[PDB]
């Protein structure tokens with residue numbers, strides 16, 4: 001699909017068996033999802049953006065369906081105000097910025 | 100152009116006659132630039148990011164060249180870790196997300 005930017009580019013994702021709404025974010029290096037339970041060992045990481053840093057749990061090799069497209073990669077879990085799909089997964093689904 | 104996301108989508112912008120580097124960010128509603136002197140009066144605005152809120156100065160009708168495309172709109176100036184080109188300006192250059 002070709003997404004216009006008049007509004008937030010929100011899509012439905014499936015992760016860990018749950019359905020969630022997330023933002024397709026070209027400005028995000030990594031994907032960050034609100035607090036939830038995921039299987040596996042994880043390692044702590046600090047992620048910084050506007051306003052500062054938050055502590056997150058880094059889970060590797062997580063499968064996520066984005067708008068119906070299966071993808072695999074690292075997912076950071078923590079206190080984010082919105083679910084964000086970053087470049088690490090956008091590349092996997094072949095997303096591009098066009099103008 | 101068609102920009103892939105294996106690397107941060109950074110482009111050159113020309114504002115106030117100066118050349119700077121900026122990130123094409125579909126996850127940002129608004130355009131935010133690092134501290135610099137812009138013309139006219141400003142209005143206050145609070146911007147919420149991943150790590151909290153910062154206070155910024157809002158300047159309207161600012162002329163900005165993005166990767167060679169002229170745009171005229173609102174620009175926020177504040178303590179951002181990187182210059183961000185948000186949806187308000189992305190729409191003016193006709194950017195879309197495609198996959």
Ligand SMILES: CC(C)CN(C[C@@H](O)[C@H](Cc1ccccc1)NC(=O)O[C@H]1CO[C@H]2OCC[C@H]21)S(=O)(=O)c1ccc(N)cc1
Pocket residue numbers: 025026027028029030031032047048049050081082084086124125126127128129130131146147148149150181185
């Ligand atoms: C600041 C950028 C370099 C990176 N940010 C992604 C960015 O797209 C966020 C993503 C974002 C989106 C909504 C809420 C929090 C974070 N948007 C944002 O900061 O925008 C602010 C200015 O415009 C306003 O409208 C959106 C919030 C304001 S980030 O959220 O801090 C971030 C940092 C590291 C990773 N791995 C993933 C994301």
